[PDB]
Amino acid sequence: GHPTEVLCLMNMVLPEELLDDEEYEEIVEDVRDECSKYGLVKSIEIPRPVDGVEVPGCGKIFVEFTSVFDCQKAMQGLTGRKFANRVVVTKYCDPDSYHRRDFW
């Protein structure tokens, strides 16, 4: 709906793929590098799974840009792009919710 400077990338990761530090770090770098083609990436949040503990937003990628315009360019460039034989699905994330790490 309402465009923000925070992009949420869905359908890109399985929780299993975020357990090992090396794999998690590689996903963070790959995400940053792809998003950097559209604007300045201020920060990234990829909630990691903890088996038996609820982790809201796990399986989702949150990328904060330095402007709303750069985020909208990222949403245009990434939405519908094929990744891991799937379809990248997106949404805007509330900036306040992002900073207080209140994901869904």
Swiss-Prot record:
It is found in: Nucleus. It comes from the Eukaryota. Interacts with U2AF1L4. Heterodimer with U2AF1. Binds unphosphorylated SF1. Interacts with SCAF11 and SNW1. Interacts with ZRSR2/U2AF1-RS2. Interacts with RBM17. Interacts with PRPF19; the interaction is direct. Interacts with POLR2A (via the C-terminal domain); Interacts with PRPF19; the interaction is direct. Interacts with POLR2A (via the C-terminal domain); recruits PRPF19 and the Prp19 complex to the pre-mRNA. Interacts with KHDC4 (Isoform 2). Interacts with ZRSR2. Interacts with the SF3B complex composed of SF3B1, SF3B2, SF3B3, SF3B4, SF3B5, SF3B6 and PHF5A. Belongs to the splicing factor SR family. This is Splicing factor U2AF 65 kDa subunit. Residues 14-95 form the RRM domain. Plays a role in pre-mRNA splicing and 3'-end processing. By recruiting PRPF19 and the PRP19C/Prp19 complex/NTC/Nineteen complex to the RNA polymerase II C-terminal domain (CTD), and thereby pre-mRNA, may couple transcription to splicing. Required for the export of mRNA out of the nucleus, even if the mRNA is encoded by an intron-less gene. Positively regulates pre-mRNA 3'-end processing by recruiting the CFIm complex to cleavage and polyadenylation signals.
